[PDB]
Design a protein around this ligand. Structure first.
Ligand SMILES: NC(=O)c1c(NC(=O)Cn2cc(CO)c(C(F)(F)F)n2)sc2c1CCCC2
Ligand SMILES: N[C@@H](CCC(=O)O)C(=O)O
Ligand SMILES: N[C@@H](CCC(=O)O)C(=O)O
Ligand SMILES: [Li+]
Ligand SMILES: [Li+]
Lengths: 263, 263
């Protein structure tokens, strides 16, 4: 039928989507800012749709419960028909690809290590061979699943430690992991995507650092319910935006034009 | 109907597909080796098909003629029904995505600069601001199209020079560009994908180098004719291989276990 206003699910994750400081003064899409707010506007312009930004109710990316088989997060909003499209730093994974459609990637990333400056850790192997510095991941996301599923010795060692560590090493939001790095005096390291790590490294108080090579190599895609008619035009818009350099412009806008820690 | 032997189109490009030194002694798929030969075997195993490797007749990646609208290269073999799948370092681009299907990417890359060691060039901006050192790209590929289409000032300057330079700066194969870098005493620089650049930098005679940041950020996908029933299983196999670390293993096998230029 006729075109309808598209419900966009997204997540508060800096610098992809952030509440504007003065958001209580504002209405609708204007409340938010960030890389994915700008991306949404570009994809909607190129595909010719009107849209409403909504923040995922449960604050999660999307995982399936092993007992109930119910999807949560942004993936769940798509699967159950609550949103029409997810425009967020949503990692392309096998499990997710089987239940939703993804565009080609709009940004690349890998899992990485964040430390408080001066922590004596340079690698995942170093984490795995000691115990004084605790380490963990986000819940309900792809980084947790990476460790849980890994058959690679160093990552399996790390998961075996993380799943049983007390107190819990897992966090509900990225911001919580960063806060824990910052407040734990070098005794917590956080495993998170390179894109988020690199953003935070250039924010005040400039007390974190990315160390080591990335652990994997993957990407974020725009997600639609399986078989949706938005899938094909959204995919072509991501490739056009990539080829026009708009994705690179946006990355510079929100990472390194935002840098507060000098050159 | 019943499963049939799958015709794979690919291209001789090191270290993705190479003739084994003793290939005249060998038959069929056994003649070839490389990252994409190993990838083909893995994708065929995971998808349950038998296959035949074939080298693209015309030795091209795939471009459309602006007059005739005919596709050449591996893209053409897919479009015209001569091959069932392309398993090669085939860049995901808008123009191509409109006519064939691509898996999610199996490797990431960007356009990059190769120099003979000691050449006084550190960047694309440096190339663009001088004339003593000639520079060019491969024909019938995505790097040429990147420059031809760019509205970015430095890249448009470079294309304006390249399209009219005499003698021609363009090459028919990667190997030809490398040979030209090596033989031109620092007076030719070659624009090529980072993956190929980094491979060649670790091969004897160890006289080339990658300089500068990548110019773009993209990926290679496995390609199938539009609407083919191999598309979905091939895409899931690429994601499973990525998540199992097989893609990373293969990259180390063919890049850095193959390195001849020391540590
Ligand atoms: N900008 C990108 O990240 C990008 C790419 N990024 C990647 O290829 C990174 N990446 C690697 C993998 C393998 O795991 C993935 C995947 F598979 F997760 F999709 N993304 S491919 C590509 C683009 C832009 C549009 C053209 C094609
Ligand atoms: N991008 C991740 C969330 C962050 C993480 O797991 O580190 C996902 O899509 O699940
Ligand atoms: N990967 C390229 C060929 C190499 C290049 O253009 O530098 C293509 O798919 O056209
Ligand atoms: Li999917
Ligand atoms: Li396509």
């Amino acid at each position: 039928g006729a075109n309808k206003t598209v419900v966009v699910t997204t997540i508060l994750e800096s610098p992809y989507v952030m509440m504007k400081k003065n958001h209580e003064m504002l209405e609708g899409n204007e409340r938010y800012e960030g890389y994915c707010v700008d991306l949404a506007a570009e994809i909607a312009k190129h595909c010719g749709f009107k849209y409403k930004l909504t923040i995922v109710g449960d604050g999660k990316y999307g995982a399936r419960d092993a007992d109930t088989k119910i999807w949560n997060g942004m993936v769940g909003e798509l699967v159950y028909g609550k949103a029409d499209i997810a425009i967020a730093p949503l990692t392309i994974t096998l499990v997710r690809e089987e239940v939703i459609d993804f565009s080609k990637p709009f940004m690349s990333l890998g899992i990485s290590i964040m430390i408080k400056k001066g922590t004596p850790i340079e690698s995942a192997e170093d984490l795995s061979k000691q115990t004084e510095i605790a380490y963990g991941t986000l819940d309900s996301g792809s980084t947790k699943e990476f460790f849980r599923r890994s058959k690679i010795a160093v990552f399996d060692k790390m998961w075996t430690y993380m799943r049983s560590a007390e107190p819990s090493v897992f966090v509900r939001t990225t911001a919580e992991g960063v806060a824990r790095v910052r407040k734990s005096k070098g005794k917590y390291a956080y495993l998170l995507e390179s894109t988020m790590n690199e953003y935070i490294e250039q924010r005040k108080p400039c007390d974190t650092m990315k160390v080591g090579g990335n652990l994997d190599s993957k990407g974020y895609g725009i997600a639609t319910p399986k078989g949706s008619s938005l899938g094909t035009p959204v995919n072509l818009a991501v490739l056009k935006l990539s080829e026009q350099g708009v994705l690179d412009k946006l990355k510079n806008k929100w990472w390194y034009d935002k840098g507060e820690c000098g050159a």
